[PDB]
Design a protein around this ligand. Sequence first.
Ligand SMILES: Nc1nc2c(ncn2[C@@H]2O[C@H](COP(=O)(O)OP(=O)(O)OP(=O)(O)O)[C@@H](O)[C@H]2O)c(=O)[nH]1
Ligand SMILES: Nc1nc2c(ncn2[C@@H]2O[C@H](COP(=O)(O)OP(=O)(O)OP(=O)(O)O)[C@@H](O)[C@H]2O)c(=O)[nH]1
Ligand SMILES: Nc1nc2c(ncn2[C@@H]2O[C@H](COP(=O)(O)OP(=O)(O)OP(=O)(O)O)[C@@H](O)[C@H]2O)c(=O)[nH]1
Ligand SMILES: Nc1nc2c(ncn2[C@@H]2O[C@H](COP(=O)(O)OP(=O)(O)OP(=O)(O)O)[C@@H](O)[C@H]2O)c(=O)[nH]1
Ligand SMILES: [Mg+2]
Ligand SMILES: [Mg+2]
Ligand SMILES: [Zn+2]
Ligand SMILES: [Zn+2]
Lengths: 356, 352
Amino acid sequence: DKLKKVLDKLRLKRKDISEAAETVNKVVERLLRRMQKRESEFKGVEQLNTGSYYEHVKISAPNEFDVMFKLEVPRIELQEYYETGAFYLVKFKGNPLSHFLEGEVLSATKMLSKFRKIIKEEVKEIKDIDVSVEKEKPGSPAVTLLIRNPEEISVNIILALESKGSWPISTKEGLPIQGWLGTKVRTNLRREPFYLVPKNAKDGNSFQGETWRLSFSHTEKYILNNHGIEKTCCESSGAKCCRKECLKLMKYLLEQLKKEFQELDAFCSYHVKTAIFHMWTQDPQDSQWDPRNLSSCFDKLLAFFLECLRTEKLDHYFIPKFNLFSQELIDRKSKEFLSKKIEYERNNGFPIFDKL
Amino acid sequence: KLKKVLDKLRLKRKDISEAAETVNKVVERLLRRMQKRESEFKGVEQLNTGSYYEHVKISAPNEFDVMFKLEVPRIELQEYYETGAFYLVKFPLSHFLEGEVLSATKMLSKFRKIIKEEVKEIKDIDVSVEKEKPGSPAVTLLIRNPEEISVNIILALESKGSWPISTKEGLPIQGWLGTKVRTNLRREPFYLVPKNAKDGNSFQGETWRLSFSHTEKYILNNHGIEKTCCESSGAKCCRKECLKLMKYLLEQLKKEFQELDAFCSYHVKTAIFHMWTQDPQDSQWDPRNLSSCFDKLLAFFLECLRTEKLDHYFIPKFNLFSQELIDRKSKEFLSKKIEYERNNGFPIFDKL
DNA sequence: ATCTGTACATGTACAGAT
DNA sequence: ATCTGTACATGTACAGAT
DNA sequence: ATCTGTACATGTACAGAT
DNA sequence: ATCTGTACATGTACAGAT
Ligand SMILES: Nc1nc2c(ncn2[C@@H]2O[C@H](COP(=O)(O)OP(=O)(O)OP(=O)(O)O)[C@@H](O)[C@H]2O)c(=O)[nH]1
Ligand SMILES: Nc1nc2c(ncn2[C@@H]2O[C@H](COP(=O)(O)OP(=O)(O)OP(=O)(O)O)[C@@H](O)[C@H]2O)c(=O)[nH]1
Ligand SMILES: Nc1nc2c(ncn2[C@@H]2O[C@H](COP(=O)(O)OP(=O)(O)OP(=O)(O)O)[C@@H](O)[C@H]2O)c(=O)[nH]1
Ligand SMILES: Nc1nc2c(ncn2[C@@H]2O[C@H](COP(=O)(O)OP(=O)(O)OP(=O)(O)O)[C@@H](O)[C@H]2O)c(=O)[nH]1
Ligand SMILES: [Mg+2]
Ligand SMILES: [Mg+2]
Ligand SMILES: [Zn+2]
Ligand SMILES: [Zn+2]
């Protein structure tokens, strides 16, 4: 109860899912077409639907869709950027990517800028949908579309490189799903390709325009939809669990707080997604996520997340040495501020869940 | 106890390597011949199946099952007399047709002639082609490493369509392995093998039988309700050991008594599939409860015998214990001999 | 004449709707 | 509890290309 | 189209620990 | 007696090269 009513509020409506997906699929399909037309450099790119809507943890409204446009790049050499584990330079062995080359090195911002120019041109030609292109955001690997379905919808077209080689060594000790999803699943997932998206920092740091960042959105999608230690978890002949509902409630808490308070700008939903992947590793049994224990299940996730904030440690699930909560990324000011806001909501009935 | 019997049944690492190097030598050479030649089975691929590749072979690595699978599009199927598993096939292979009917006997016999020719050319291994068992879908090789090793080479057609409607209700794993696993498995191809021998009551020679050896192998190696069952970071179960004990009990009874000729290890494999479905939780197969697990398997197999009903796990209407397949007499004999061993501490488990 | 990238045809898990 | 729209994986048809 | 290279599942074999 | 850790061995998926 009580948290069940919040989830009722957060539950997406099928009427809205239809209207939104109808428009979104028309726009995405046309953009994917134009990428294959001509001697375009992005010929061959394939679509991958990712993120919370395709993991079924989108909340409130179907107003934001992530879609990777992924391009296989056969012979590629990687160079780690300053032992960060997550950031790389790409290098190469006629070739469509040549215009973005900078002496062996693939420029991310050069690729993205031409990707984006092509997108904007195609968008000019959509005459039956109110759709434009958001101004570029620092740090975004995406070209974001703003659709007015009347209702506002964002579509993030994420540009990605696809390598089918084995994953970079910095992930060797990531994905610690052995006690939970098991060794066969882990091995099979690491047989899948890995992905590189533009870092696009705009900070002024050296190599800024040529650094890429690993993405595991496809793996995360598989894990969200195959999340139980039992194969029948949340299936029609198995037992429902509350894992996704805890992720929804945590996402909602952060979203509500983030739109009230500018102090929380450095925080994003990927921080809560990473924290709950750790909780799912720490508590692997499906019975540690009984729907009847939704309150304490949510409560123990808060407690884990507060400890991550207090101790300033939230390791990337796929790249253990990459701390999303380091000082270099988020001030202790920000963290103590969110720690107190969460602490407050937790001990006063979650008044922010009733906001708006 | 049963632990001690399981130590006996366990294969030796040295034996596995000595047997497999020889077997792989012959098999690659045979698979090469169907391939690098202008043969009508150009295309076949190797599919290793059965107990050795499922890690439930017992006593010795002395029998190997290999599918040579050949893809065929269109391949319209017609069911044989509502039996479920038996079909005629319709429409390189035109040499084996009759009246738009693909004759299993005619394709097997050329398949067999090919293998015999290639076997005559192997001069580095003592290997011969066993006399054909009429019906049987296999061409069987006998190898004397020095040890005797059978290699059954099973001709199969591979089809990519929806599985035939007689399986629609089979593979009832939804509460054990789940719906996603079942749907994924039924997205795999299905196989037909040239199993014949209906004495001489005709249609005999053009019949094929459905094979699910590929699905069974996936199940054997992905058998828990938890994904970690028998993995290095999960808990061991005793499901496979129970299958081994049951196989050995029938193996030992069949050596003794010719009354049990109609019985085969597949009857045991089918029965334990049903019991794994009845008892899906991994905790119902705890290693510490090996005995009661073996016993409840015994009691289910006896119930199958008593009721004369052991449905094909993939084809529910096909009763492997029908009066037409196994005489009522044979099933009461097997009942009495199993009840005997059970009630006396399994003496046959001691004898050599 | 034959070949094939594109898209339709089929089936079902997920989860919202009634 | 059943009915149902979307997403998605795989099998296959054929208009347009060679 | 074929075949090697790699990674890790699944097994057995045995000493040291429990 | 059983459990545990390391070593030893085959099977099998698939990327990448030719
Ligand atoms: N490695 C890495 N991945 C990120 C990061 N931020 C976002 N992602 C990925 O981006 C995808 C979508 O990002 P978001 O739109 O912000 O959040 P979401 O998962 O779609 O959830 P919603 O906010 O409800 O849309 C996820 O599938 C993540 O895998 C990051 O900082 N590092
Ligand atoms: N598939 C996929 N989508 C991503 C990934 N990273 C980001 N996105 C999407 O792109 C949008 C902006 O990208 P970010 O890099 O996360 O934005 P940012 O500038 O770093 O700022 P914050 O999200 O607050 O950390 C997000 O809302 C996601 O929807 C990724 O790694 N994979
Ligand atoms: N559908 C079906 N499959 C069969 C039948 N008999 C044998 N098989 C299949 O053939 C494979 C090998 O058969 P066998 O060598 O007789 O037995 P096994 O499973 O390998 O076990 P062992 O007796 O120890 O060698 C099995 O995995 C079965 O899938 C049958 O009568 N019907
Ligand atoms: N992989 C695989 N091997 C099979 C299959 N069917 C038969 N075999 C092999 O062929 C051998 C003999 O075939 P059986 O199914 O026993 O048929 P049979 O030899 O005509 O004699 P019966 O058992 O009396 O019907 C088995 O021991 C298996 O090794 C199958 O469907 N898949
Ligand atoms: Mg989303
Ligand atoms: Mg066998
Ligand atoms: Zn669940
Ligand atoms: Zn197990």
